[PDB]
Design an enzyme around this catalytic site. Structure first.
Site, short mmCIF file in Angstrom:
data_model
loop_
_atom_site.label_atom_id
_atom_site.label_comp_id
_atom_site.label_asym_id
_atom_site.label_seq_id
_atom_site.Cartn_x
_atom_site.Cartn_y
_atom_site.Cartn_z
N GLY A 28 24.00 96.39 35.93
CA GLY A 28 24.11 95.15 35.17
C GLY A 28 25.49 94.49 35.18
O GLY A 28 26.06 94.18 36.23
N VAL A 30 23.68 91.31 33.12
CA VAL A 30 22.40 91.09 33.80
C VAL A 30 21.51 92.29 33.51
O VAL A 30 21.96 93.44 33.60
CB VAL A 30 22.61 90.90 35.33
CG1 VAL A 30 21.29 90.80 36.06
CG2 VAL A 30 23.48 89.67 35.61
N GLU A 63 25.75 76.03 37.06
CA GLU A 63 24.93 77.17 37.51
C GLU A 63 23.45 76.89 37.34
O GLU A 63 22.65 77.14 38.26
CB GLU A 63 25.33 78.49 36.83
CG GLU A 63 24.48 79.69 37.28
CD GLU A 63 25.06 81.05 36.86
OE1 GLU A 63 25.94 81.11 35.97
OE2 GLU A 63 24.66 82.07 37.47
N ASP A 142 32.25 83.55 47.51
CA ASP A 142 32.36 84.98 47.13
C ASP A 142 31.27 85.86 47.77
O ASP A 142 30.71 86.74 47.09
CB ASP A 142 32.34 85.15 45.62
CG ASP A 142 32.98 86.45 45.18
OD1 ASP A 142 33.64 87.11 46.00
OD2 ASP A 142 32.79 86.82 44.02
C1 LIG Z 1 29.35 77.85 38.36
C2 LIG Z 1 28.64 78.37 39.62
C3 LIG Z 1 27.62 79.21 39.63
N1 LIG Z 1 27.30 79.41 40.94
C4 LIG Z 1 26.28 80.16 41.41
C5 LIG Z 1 25.61 80.99 40.54
C6 LIG Z 1 24.51 81.78 40.97
N2 LIG Z 1 23.84 82.55 40.09
C7 LIG Z 1 23.12 83.67 40.42
O1 LIG Z 1 23.13 84.18 41.54
C8 LIG Z 1 22.25 84.35 39.35
C9 LIG Z 1 21.99 83.80 38.08
C10 LIG Z 1 21.17 84.46 37.17
C11 LIG Z 1 20.57 85.68 37.53
C12 LIG Z 1 19.67 86.42 36.54
C13 LIG Z 1 20.81 86.22 38.78
N3 LIG Z 1 20.24 87.39 39.13
C14 LIG Z 1 20.91 88.50 39.50
N4 LIG Z 1 22.21 88.70 39.19
C15 LIG Z 1 22.85 89.80 39.54
C16 LIG Z 1 22.15 90.79 40.25
C17 LIG Z 1 20.80 90.57 40.59
C18 LIG Z 1 20.04 91.50 41.35
C19 LIG Z 1 20.65 92.65 41.89
C20 LIG Z 1 19.88 93.56 42.66
C21 LIG Z 1 18.52 93.26 42.87
N5 LIG Z 1 17.95 92.15 42.38
C22 LIG Z 1 18.67 91.27 41.62
N6 LIG Z 1 20.21 89.43 40.19
C23 LIG Z 1 21.65 85.56 39.70
C24 LIG Z 1 24.10 81.68 42.32
C25 LIG Z 1 24.76 80.83 43.20
C26 LIG Z 1 24.32 80.76 44.68
F1 LIG Z 1 24.56 81.84 45.36
F2 LIG Z 1 23.03 80.55 44.84
F3 LIG Z 1 24.99 79.86 45.31
C27 LIG Z 1 25.85 80.05 42.76
C28 LIG Z 1 28.12 78.66 41.69
N7 LIG Z 1 28.94 78.02 40.87
#
Ligand SMILES: Cc1cn(-c2cc(NC(=O)c3ccc(C)c(Nc4nccc(-c5cccnc5)n4)c3)cc(C(F)(F)F)c2)cn1
Ligand SMILES: [Cl-]
Length: 333
Positions: A28, A30, A63, A142
């Protein structure tokens, strides 16, 4: 907290979620969970103090809006968004719900020596998702193994999570022009990171595991070779220049000798990603066409995105305005 929500504490943080989400478990901030409405496992993220400051409020909105926008098989998919708030007066928390995959790329590398065919398929998807992200005018900035989630069948999605504890350093994957404070870096920074990731999938270990900033640069120069003064000038600030100039000159190494035993096509593609001069890095779109991906490449199934429009989020507004805008975005989902 709304009716139909319940509260629990998960490692000294309070979570308030609807009944449809059960069995929260830190991954986590998350958690994994079962969403009874969608009838599948999901990841849930509780944003950290979303309206603490203007920049947090702007990033909270971004986001949410960016994940609404990006719909692609190789990018984490937004499935739900909620708040325990009953009205705008008590709107203070934002929760995002996404696909949950089996594991991340670190897990994969740690447990297995990956076949060349699996490396092809994983990097192919990473690039396909990246093509889509870049077509939107978005830079990831990143990419690293902990930001790439994968299932047992090697299906892959890009995400962005946002020091002593399975920690994976950004430093090891960051383009040298970002490290050297080049003010005008662009999406090619992500291609450097993909080259680092692919190298790691091939060899089972990180390519440039720098213990600090200077060690990071030394490791990179030792492989790619010290840049000419002309190239150094376009990848660095005036002050960061000296860090490079003080190193002894290093010749470029043959990547065939670093990745002995890898598919020569893998080596060829790596040499088009791991270069200091951005003009010479392959785009994600072009990289998909490389023979290393000939098993998977399909020009009709590698889609572009609509441009992400930054106009709304870029306009100056007060913290109170940010809350109202974001509240409407939450409720509209
Ligand atoms: C201010 C800002 C935000 N971003 C940005 C945010 C996200 N958010 C998530 O990936 C995100 C948000 C909420 C959740 C619940 C998750 N899910 C998540 N988070 C961490 C681990 C896992 C996970 C790990 C292992 C297996 N399955 C899921 N899932 C991701 C994604 C992106 C991307 F890559 F698409 F460009 C960009 C860019 N600028
Ligand atoms: Cl909802």
């Amino acid at each position: 907290m709304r009716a139909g929500f319940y509260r629990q504490e998960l490692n000294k943080t309070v979570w308030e979620v609807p009944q449809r989400l059960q069995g929260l478990r830190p991954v986590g901030s998350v958690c994994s969970a079962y969403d009874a409405r969608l009838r599948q496992k999901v990841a849930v993220k509780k944003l950290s103090r979303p309206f603490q400051s203007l920049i947090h409020a702007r990033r909270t909105y971004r986001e949410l809006r960016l994940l609404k926008h990006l719909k692609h098989e190789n990018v984490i998919g937004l499935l739900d968004v909620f708040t325990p708030a009953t009205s705008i007066e008590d709107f203070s928390e934002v929760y995002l719900v996404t696909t949950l995959m089996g594991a991340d790329l670190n897990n994969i590398v740690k447990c297995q020596a990956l076949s060349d065919e699996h490396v092809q398929f994983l990097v192919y998807q990473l690039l396909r998702g990246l093509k889509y992200i870049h077509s939107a005018g978005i830079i990831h900035r990143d990419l690293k193994p902990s930001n790439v989630a994968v299932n047992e069948d090697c299906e892959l999605r890009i995400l962005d999570f946002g020091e002593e504890m399975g920690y994976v350093a950004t430093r090891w994957y960051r383009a040298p022009e970002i490290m050297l404070n080049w003010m005008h870096y662009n999406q090619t920074v992500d291609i450097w990171s993909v080259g680092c990731i692919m190298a790691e999938l091939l060899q089972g270990k990180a390519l440039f595991p720098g213990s600090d900033y200077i060690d990071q640069l030394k490791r990179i120069m030792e492989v790619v070779g010290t840049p000419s003064p002309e190239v150094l000038a376009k990848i660095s600030s005036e002050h960061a220049r000296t860090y490079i100039q003080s190193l002894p000159p290093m010749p470029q190494k043959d990547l065939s000798s670093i990745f002995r035993g890898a598919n020569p096509l893998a080596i060829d593609l790596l040499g088009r990603m791991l270069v200091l001069d951005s003009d010479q890095r392959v785009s994600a779109a072009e990289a998909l066409a490389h023979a290393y991906f000939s098993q998977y490449h399909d020009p009709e199934d590698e889609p572009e995105a609509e441009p992400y429009d930054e106009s709304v989020e870029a306009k100056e507004r007060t913290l109170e305005e940010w809350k109202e805008l974001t509240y409407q975005e939450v409720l509209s989902f």
